[PDB]
Amino acid sequence: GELKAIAQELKAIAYELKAIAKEDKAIAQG
Amino acid sequence: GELKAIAQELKAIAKELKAIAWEHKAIAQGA
Amino acid sequence: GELKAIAQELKAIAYELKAIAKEDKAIAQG
Amino acid sequence: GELKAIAQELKAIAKELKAIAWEHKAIAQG
Amino acid sequence: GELKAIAQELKAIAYELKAIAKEDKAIAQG
Amino acid sequence: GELKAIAQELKAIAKELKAIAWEHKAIAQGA
Prior knowledge:
heterohexamer; A: mainly alpha; 1 helix; rod-shaped; B: mainly alpha; 0% strand; de novo protein; coiled coil domain; hexamer
């Protein structure tokens, strides 16, 4: 279904943000 | 319900942005 | 309702982006 | 209507992102 | 259509993120 | 339909965010 496809894209977005939070903590450490 | 799944992923997104906001404050304030 | 729950999460998201903009402005003006 | 409310929150999100991009352009340049 | 309006706001969001990606690449590329 | 168009735009947003993550990794590690 299209609603599930929307939820799946939001999941993907959540994980790109996890990567960004990871890197930014690295930057705030260095 | 997939509408509830969508709300849940948006909640997750909010949480990550809050983490990012925290690190940006660190950078701003000298950490 | 579930539609309102989605709107509320998008409000939370706007709120956090507002925080990030604030911090990035302080960084940029420093 | 809650669909409208969702559109409005997306508007707010795009607004905050435009501010963030502004600040990052400043960092980039100066 | 309110669904159309949602898609349009999402398109605006993608646009601003594109801008932020360009600026952050510049910040990194030097 | 518009539900598909919405999933479309979300996909594009995830793409942009992936790019951002990579740039930030460069910054984090110098490049």
